[PDB]
C-alpha cells in the first residue's frame, strides 16, 4: 500500500516521486525501461569513443526557466553559455545572404509586415488558459496554408518554413498553424525567441541531473511496463506487463501523450479526451547526430533540403566534428546512409560523413514520439483538460505543459502542480 | 461671375482648377506669390551655378502614391530611381553598426517587440474615418513618452527618434505620437515603409509637372493674395488685397493650413474647427541643402545630433559635393553659418562646408508652414473637419489629407474629392 505510485521515470516522474517522499508519503516509481531520465537520453557517442553526447537536449535558458535553474543550483550542476554560429551555409535562393539572418534588405518590407501577422495571431492565445478555450479554430489550419496567406517573399518564406519543420518535427501540410503560434506565445511572444532562447546548455549533459533526482528516490522498479491503472476499488490499482500489479491512493502518470493509448483505463478517461489520445500527436521529429570531417567550427546550414537545419554541434577532434541535423521520421530515412550522405552535400559538398548517432523516438514503445506536436484540429477540441486528473489519477510531462510545452522546465512545472494536489488535498 | 474659384497655385489649386476646366466649367486661378507650385520649390541653386536643386521634395513613390504616377503618365514626365546609399557614419553609439539598418544583434528581440507595439497602435487607425472620432486620445501624447512606453535600448530608440524628428520636423518633446502612427498607417502600416517611400524622383524639378498643369488653366492671376471669403450672397465673394474683389458659385481654397488665419471667412467657419487654424500645426522642418568638399559618394548619417539625418542629395562635381540635412526651425538656427559648420563636424569631421540653400517655409507669410505637422492634441479633437467643405467653401490641401498627409500626393487626393464634390453638387 503506497501513498502515491509515479508511473515513468523521466524528469516528471523523477520530481514528482522525491517531491512526495519529502512530505512524508510512500512513493514508489514504475519505470518500463532499462535506465531514468526518458527523453532526456545523455549516452556515448556510437560514432566517437569516449564522447558523451546529447541525444535527447540539454539546451536551457535561466531566466525563462526557473524550476530547471533551481534543480541546477539544488545539486550544483554547473551551466556554460551555448555555442554561437560564425559560419554560414545556406540554401535559400540566388539573392539570400550567408549569415545570422539571411534575409535580404528587398524583403524588409513584407518581413516587417508579417511579423505583425503572426505577433497578432499568437498574441490572442493565453498560456494559462487552453488551445481549446480560446475560439482559437480558425488557427488551427495546416502550416503551409497559413503561410500562403502571409504571401512571404522567397528566401522568408523558406527560412520561416525550415526552421517550423525543425522546431515541430512535422512537415508544413501536417503542421497546425495554432501549434506553431503557440510555439511563440510560449517564448514570450516572439518569433525569434523560439531560435534565441537557447542560452545555456548543460555542461556536463542530462545524465548528472536525472541520477541526483534518483538518489532522493527511495523505491524505483526499472523493466516495469505499466499496461493498465484501476481506481474502481476505494484504492486505485497498477498492473504491469509481468503479471504483478502495485496498489496506491492516488496515481501519477508521467508517461509521453502517445503511450497513454497503451495502457487500460478504468473507468475510462474523459469522452473529450478519449479520441485524440487514440490518434496521437503528429510528432514525428528527428534528430541525427553527423560525424563528419572537413567541417569547420560553428557551421550554420539553414536551407530547403530534406533536411531544413544542419548546424555545429561539437568538436570530436582537430578534423573530426559532430553535426546536427533536425528533420521528421516520416520523410526523411535514417537507415539509409546514401541518402544521409545526399542531405549533407546539399549545403556542403566538401564535408564527408564518416557516420551517424541518433534514436528512432516514434520506433520506440515507451514513446512513440519524441517532443508533443498536435495534427490538424486535435488541440482546438481537447489540449488543457489532457494534463488534468481525472479522479485520483494525474497526468504530466512535457506533452501536457501550456506554459513551456517540450521543454524540461514543462516537465518540471507540470510535475509540480500534481504534487500539490495529492498534498492540500 | 465664375463657375469655382480656386484660391492657392500649388498641386492641389492646380489639379483643382484644371479638372473643373478640364469638366467644362469657368475657373479662375489666384496665386498670391510670384510663382506657381508653392512648397514644390525646384530651382537652380545659389551655391553651384546651373545646378538645379529641389528647395521642397521631389522624393516619390509610385506604388505609395498611385496619383502622382498618374500625372507622371499623363504628361510624360519622367523620374528617376532613388540616390541609393553606401557610404554610412551613424552616430548611435559603439554598440550600432555601420550600416542602412544599423540597429545590432542583441536588440533584434528587442525590435521585434516594439515593432509589434508600434504596428498594432498604427493599425487602430482607420484613415478614412478621420483621428478626431476613433477614440485615440491615448495615442496623441508627446512622443518621448511614447516611445518611453515601449523601453527601447540605445539603438534602436535613438535610430526611431531620429527619423521622427525628419518626418514630423518637430522634437520628440513637440512631435505627438498620433501623428508618428498616423504616418506609418499612410505608409500601408510600416515603419520601413516611411523611408523607404524615397524611391524615384523628379528628373527635371517638380518645375516640370507644376507648368505642365499650369498651361491647362486658362484664368491664372500672379501676385493675388486672397483677403477674405464671403458666401453669404446669392453667389461667393472673394476679396484680394489687391484688385478686389472675384465671384464664384463656388469657391476652393488650396492656400497651406497655417494661412487660413489671415483669410476672413463670412459666415465664421465652424465652431470645430476655429481652435485648430488659428494656432496652426506645430510642424517646423526644415530642410537645409549644404554645399561640401571632400565628402563621400553616399553617404548616411543617422545619430543623435540638432541634424538627425544627414545624408547624400546630389554629385556637384569629382570633389564638390550637394548634402541635405533635416531638422526643426526652432530647435536650429539655419542663418549661423557657424552652426552649420559644427553640425555637418558631429558626423562628418573630415567635410569642409562652402556654403548652404535653404527657405524658412515658417517666416514665409505665404505658407507659415512646411508640411503638416500637428501640436499634442490637436487631431484627436480635430481633424477630418478641417478638410471637409464649410458651405460653397471647399477646403483641400496636403495639410488636410487623411490618405496620404504631407505629401504631394495629399494635394492631388484632395484636389480630386472638391472637384468631384462641387461637379456633382
Ligand atoms: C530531439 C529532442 C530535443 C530536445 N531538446 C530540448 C531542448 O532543447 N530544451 C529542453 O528543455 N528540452 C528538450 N527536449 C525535451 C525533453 O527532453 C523532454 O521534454 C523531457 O525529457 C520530458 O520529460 P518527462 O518526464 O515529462 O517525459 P519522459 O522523459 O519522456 O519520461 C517518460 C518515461 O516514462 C517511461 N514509460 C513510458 N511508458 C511507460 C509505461 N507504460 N510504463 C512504465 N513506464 C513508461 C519511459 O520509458 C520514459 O522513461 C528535447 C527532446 C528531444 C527528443
Ligand atoms: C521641405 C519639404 C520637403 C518635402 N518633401 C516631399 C517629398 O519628399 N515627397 C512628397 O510627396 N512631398 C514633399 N513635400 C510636401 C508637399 O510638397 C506639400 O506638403 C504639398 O504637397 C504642397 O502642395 P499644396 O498644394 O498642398 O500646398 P501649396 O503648394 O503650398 O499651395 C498653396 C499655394 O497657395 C498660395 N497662397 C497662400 N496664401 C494665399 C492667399 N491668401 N491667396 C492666394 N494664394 C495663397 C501659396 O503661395 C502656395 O503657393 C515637401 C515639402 C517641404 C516643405
Ligand atoms: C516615424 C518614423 C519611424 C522611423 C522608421 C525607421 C525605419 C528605418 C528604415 C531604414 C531601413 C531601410 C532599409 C533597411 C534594410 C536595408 O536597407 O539594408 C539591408 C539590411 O536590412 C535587412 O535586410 C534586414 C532587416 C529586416 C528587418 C525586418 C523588421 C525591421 C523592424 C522595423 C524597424 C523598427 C525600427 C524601430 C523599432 C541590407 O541591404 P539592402 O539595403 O540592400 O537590403
Ligand atoms: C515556429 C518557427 C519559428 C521560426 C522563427 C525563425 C527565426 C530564426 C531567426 C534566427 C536568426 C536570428 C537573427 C538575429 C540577428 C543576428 O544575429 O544576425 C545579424 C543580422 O540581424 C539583425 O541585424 C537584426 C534585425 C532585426 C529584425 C527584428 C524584426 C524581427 C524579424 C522577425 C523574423 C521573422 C521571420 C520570417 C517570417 C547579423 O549581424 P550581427 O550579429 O552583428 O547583428
Known sequence: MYDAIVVGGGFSGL????????????????????????????????????????????????????????????????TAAASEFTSFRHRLGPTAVDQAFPIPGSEAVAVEAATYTLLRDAHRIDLEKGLENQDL???????????????????????????????????????????????????????????????????????????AMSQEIPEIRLQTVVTGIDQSGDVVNVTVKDGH???????????????????????????????????????????????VRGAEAGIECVGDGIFPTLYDYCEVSESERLLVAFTDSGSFDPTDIGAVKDAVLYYLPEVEVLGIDYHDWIADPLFEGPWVAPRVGQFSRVHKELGEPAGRIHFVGSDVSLEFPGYIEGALETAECAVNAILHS
Chains 1, 2 share one sequence.
Open 15 to 78: 520530481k514528482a516521486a522525491r517531491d512526495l517522499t519529502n512530505a512524508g508519503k510512500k512513493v514508489l516509481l514504475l519505470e518500463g525501461g532499462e535506465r531514468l531520465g526518458g527523453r532526456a537520453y545523455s549516452r556515448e557517442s556510437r560514432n566517437v569513443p569516449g564522447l558523451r553526447v546529447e541525444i535527447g537536449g540539454a539546451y536551457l535558458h535561466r531566466k525563462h526557466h526557473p524550476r530547471l535553474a533551481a534543480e541546477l543550483d539544488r545539486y550544483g550542476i554547473p
Open 137 to 211: 479554430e480558425d488557427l488551427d489550419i495546416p502550416l503551409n496554408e497559413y503561410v500562403d496567406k502571409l504571401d512571404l517573399p522567397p528566401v522568408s518564406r523558406q527560412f520561416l518554413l525550415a526552421w517550423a519543420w525543425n522546431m515541430l518535427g512535422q512537415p508544413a501540410d501536417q503542421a497546425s498553424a495554432l501549434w506553431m503560434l503557440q510555439l511563440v506565445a510560449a517564448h514570450h511572444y516572439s518569433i525569434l525567441g523560439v531560435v534565441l532562447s537557447l542560452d545555456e546548455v548543460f555542461s556536463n549533459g542530462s545524465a548528472d541531473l536525472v541520477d
Open 245 to 291: 500489479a502495485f496498489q496506491a491512493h492516488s496515481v501519477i502518470v508521467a508517461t509521453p501523450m502517445n503511450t497513454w493509448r497503451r495502457i487500460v483505463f478504468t473507468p475510462a478517461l474523459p469522452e473529450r479526451r478519449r479520441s485524440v489520445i487514440e490518434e496521437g500527436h503528429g510528432g514525428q521529429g528527428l534528430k541525427i547526430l553527423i560525424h
